[PDB]
């Protein structure tokens, strides 16, 4: 049970950690293309 | 660009006018604005598409023999190309994919209308 | 053996047999369920035979098969069906499994139950079997008697019945300090965790109540708790209980818990309350906090470490960009003088003023209130020669005092403010002189400055005309102060207005600052502004999208809303306009405040990007998140950005670093030397811009703000709590190369490192160096580990939030705190145990005038 | 000497410490790689003898000394923990008939290793430090019984084992409690392949495949191997072969190619037989019989003609070898299946033949069973023809298509399903190089 509420809970972050990225993923993806234009 | 060469002081530049002799490029700072209105219509550039697309470019089966032959010619180009695998180039790996891959979409959609 | 007979015995009659089938089966299920897995259809029907009693055998048997089939809500259900065949103390991994399996089900159920009702758990809707077994394990958790074990469950279990009893029972049990701490352990946790604050807010009240049981509980706990609840009654209950418990230091320290935490809006309730409650005026006098301003200034005036020579070297480095560089150094001087009240360089170059420009002339006047910030009398007289009616050389200089005034008086200048607002209101419906408009604007600036957080419709209103008066000069400030006034949940009508005026009013800036005001009066509203957020998001115009993030920030700042962040990201991801993204990136570190942690890892993407603005917006938020914190790790990410070809980028990076780097310097952080010199390097460099040197000189002056002896603090673990005023200067400074005469707002988060005796009484200021060794960073700082050993010198100066807490008091002197070195330099207050005796007497400029 | 032996173990423990740090990606694969090196030094001599001292002193270490049972002595709570387990791992490892003969000593010790302070807390911790093969591989030997009487009641230890393996199937929590798992099944599978009907294989199938990645392709293939033989008398052939076609190279075995992959191949040969395909044994001539194919060749040799007599004779001769491999049950079907195969080429070529020529081939075989025998044939398709005895004319269809059907394009979706094949699995292997650059 115990130390996880301490520990385990801190992994919700690591969930978001993914969730930070695939967002930013499309960024570079698009940031590519409109930039892929001018180059 | 836009020049207008002189200032009040500045955004307030300040000296060269009061100290005289202002000769410079001196841009202003550009922007512009329109709307989503035209934007949509502007994105409307590219009856219409139905007349214009599938079905207008159903023109595909006519040349299948060439569409073969194209692919058939895609063939030879490659062992040749691959061969070099054994800088300067005509790269062994390059066109190979590129060569065929284009066809695919039309090669694909050839089906669709039915 | 193999189940074929038991497979056969199944359909065979004589429920006796079926029992002995099931019996024998049950024992050998474990292996042979595999064969038996095909008999489950009958077994199902078997569990549907009330005729055959034991079928709970088969049910749990099926549950055995179902784990062995990976079926669980199946298994659980039939284990639930068992109740007899099943027991918790029955030990198999399976049993342990199915239980743990069965358990989790409860949580979302309970949470879904929690969704609608928060007394859901008081009711039947969850299968009680689980709930029982749940609580039975919670009982076992109680018998485990490590209760976060139980709590974090009941945390999600949302069962205060469990929780409170678990506390209350344990309360009388043992752990005098722990039963307090166990709460805090969970309470501090609860703050970090619970989605619905109500469940947590429920904790907070009971927590207080648990603590209000009081074998003298820790109040700053309750303070923050209260400050988290902002429930005056509790504090008032405290105050009574306080007055019941009354001791100066107790009250004082409580009021010191209070003066450092409760919002300008919240606390003033308690003021009139405490007024109405009867009181000790010391409390009302602590409500000043001017003692701090004094002490801070006292600290400053004493402990200011200046070296304007290098700033002179930075100022003598150039006057250039006409103003726009000369502009900056008009500020860093203010930093080193912030609250310090000195004109040093101001006198040095009087031709400075010549080299100032109407706005810089304006700004140079606004450069004062910084310098004098915390002089709650002089500053007006300081501004007096430059006040309106004292004339000026420039109307903007004349306008400058107006804004410059409130800098000291923010929240305390309302009278003069409203007074000046009268001058505003005077010129509000008229007077389109730019000179006036500044005199309007500079006033339109300083108005909401002091009016910030205080709800005054006039502030909103009077500006709303000055706003609607459509002076890009003037109307801008309105778009701020109006936000500042109603900064809070504000009102959606102004929002409509603003948002209307946004789309309505035609201007870049006037339209711009609106969303900022929108960002303001949407503060902590979170879910609320999402509409306008969505509206702002849906805006064609950057500006609404722009402030949307800031709106989203002030809503969700501090605690990360992933979705918000996720939005903000994707927004920054999905917007053409870079500044928005830049902004959107910037505002992240607000909703990303509470964890600076991943922010480097966060920006480590945006660190690396084609675009400067992206790479620009990076610098701030991270530079913001760790501003009051560490992570050269975080820092070092930006040093490449400090070399990003755009000076404006590195300029930001310059800033961003120093925002972190104050007090952190000198082989604690060796890098500061370069970073400093980099400025100087740049400051030396002619091929570096007045972008570059700007931030450089400023970021220098940043590090040197408040005689370099002061810090930058937000959501201060000192209070554990936010202060919006800390934020403001940032968001204010946000648009600066946009609108330059701003950053002086940044004076807000300036924070004392002061360590000064004070008293648990009216203060003889006995100053002692309490001497507990830190690895010594009062030795690590600009020129011009814990060894539990006596530290050299503990009185004021550098300290550190940490180097605070490697230092503990001597009990030997007359005065001792109850909170036993509460641990926060700025809060000081050695509590007074032995007055009118030795531990002598020490005074200050307060003691002089105040 | 014993040193260098232990020095390996030391270095292993050194890498076990790399597990005592964390997974064990190395350590396991190290242990794996070490398990390869397990052959080299070996003995027990002062290996096990100082091992006690090297272990000294833990109780189970002294318990394992019961397995040592020798003259060791000499001299030499934390560093001794999973090492001892890892040595208990080696304790297993020790016993391969390496450093052992009768593991029935160790059988008990297996349990008395596995059960005590083991088979307990390991869920994610011990990462297939269990080798249940090595567990059972012991009993695998013992299952040379015969002898044990079974033994017991029948044979409950192996029963209990299945249950004990079940006790891991229990412990298989899908928390990554996996790798070893379907060996336990592979066991039970081959335990069905001892006496049993796998069909709870379907229930085994119901759970999972050995998911997924971290398992040795071997067992993953050895999964399929048995998983084939499911479909064997489940009478799915393709999928069975598809398992073989998921099995063979593919789990690289070369050492295990010799005895073991023949078995694999032995079954593989049977498949196309079940499908009547008879691929070219031209290679299957070699690395084969010797000890595997050639009866299948003899079968194929028959199955090319499918002359029942001549066919049967093969079986009649190789039945015991069939029997040895329990491939006997097969091929009885394929008897007329080739006779029917020939039927197709008897000249179904003519759009008929008359009854009694297509009877003639059966008038070469039997009569008016023809009616059946052709209906017996026409039944399954396997030929497309028609008849009516009213006509007494056995009418053999076109079998002719201008295809222009999806038929090849099915075979493209096949290809297409590989259009990603590594094309995707590159992106799979794009991470490893570049994200280990990030470390």
Swiss-Prot record, chain A:
It is found in: Cytoplasm; Nucleus. It comes from the Eukaryota. N-acetylated by NAT3. The 26S proteasome is involved in the ATP-dependent degradation of ubiquitinated proteins. The regulatory (or ATPase) complex confers ATP dependency and substrate specificity to the 26S complex. Belongs to the AAA ATPase family. This is 26S proteasome regulatory subunit 6B homolog. It comes from Saccharomyces cerevisiae (strain ATCC 204508 / S288c). The lineage of its organism: Eukaryota, Fungi, Dikarya, Ascomycota, Saccharomycotina. The gene is RPT3. The chain holds residues 48 to 86 of 428 of the full protein.
From Swiss-Prot, chain B:
This is Ubiquitin carboxyl-terminal hydrolase RPN11. The lineage of its organism: Eukaryota, Fungi, Dikarya, Ascomycota, Saccharomycotina. Component of the lid subcomplex of the 26S proteasome, a multiprotein complex involved in the ATP-dependent degradation of ubiquitinated proteins. RPN11 is the only catalytically active member of the lid and serves as the essential deubiquitinase of the proteasome. Belongs to the peptidase M67A family. Disulfide bonds: none annotated. N-acetylated by NAT3. Present with 16400 molecules/cell in log phase SD medium. The JAMM motif is required for the deubiquitination and degradation of ubiquitinated substrates. Component of the lid subcomplex of the 19S proteasome regulatory particle complex (also named PA700 complex). The 26S proteasome consists of a 20S proteasome core and two 19S regulatory subunits. Interacts directly with RPN8 and STS1. The gene is RPN11. It comes from Saccharomyces cerevisiae (strain ATCC 204508 / S288c).
Swiss-Prot record, chain C:
GO terms for biological process: proteasome assembly; proteasome-mediated ubiquitin-dependent protein catabolic process; regulation of protein catabolic process; ubiquitin-dependent protein catabolic process. Keywords: Acetylation, Phosphoprotein, Proteasome, Repeat. One of its GO terms (cellular component) is proteasome regulatory particle, base subcomplex. N-acetylated by NAT1. GO terms for molecular function: enzyme regulator activity; ubiquitin protein ligase binding. PC repeats lie at residues 363-396, 400-437, 442-476, 477-511, 513-546, 547-582, 583-615, 617-651, 652-689, 695-731. Coiled coil: none annotated. Interacts with UBR1. PANTHER family: 26S PROTEASOME NON-ATPASE REGULATORY SUBUNIT (PTHR10943), 26S PROTEASOME NON-ATPASE REGULATORY SUBUNIT 1 (PTHR10943:SF2). Present with 4750 molecules/cell in log phase SD medium. Belongs to the proteasome subunit S1 family. Acts as a regulatory subunit of the 26S proteasome which is involved in the ATP-dependent degradation of ubiquitinated proteins. This is 26S proteasome regulatory subunit RPN2. It comes from Saccharomyces cerevisiae (strain ATCC 204508 / S288c) (Baker's yeast).
Curated annotation (Swiss-Prot), chain D:
The modification Phosphoserine is found at residue 405. PROSITE patterns: PCI. N-acetylated by NAT1. Residues 221-401 form the PCI domain. Pfam families: PCI, Rpn3_C. The modification N-acetylalanine is found at residue 2. It comes from the Eukaryota. Keywords: Acetylation, Phosphoprotein, Proteasome. One of its GO terms (cellular component) is proteasome complex. The 26S proteasome is composed of a core protease, known as the 20S proteasome, capped at one or both ends by the 19S regulatory complex (RC). The RC is composed of at least 18 different subunits in two subcomplexes, the base and the lid, which form the portions proximal and distal to the 20S proteolytic core, respectively. Present with 16700 molecules/cell in log phase SD medium. Belongs to the proteasome subunit S3 family. Acts as a regulatory subunit of the 26S proteasome which is involved in the ATP-dependent degradation of ubiquitinated proteins. This is 26S proteasome regulatory subunit RPN3.
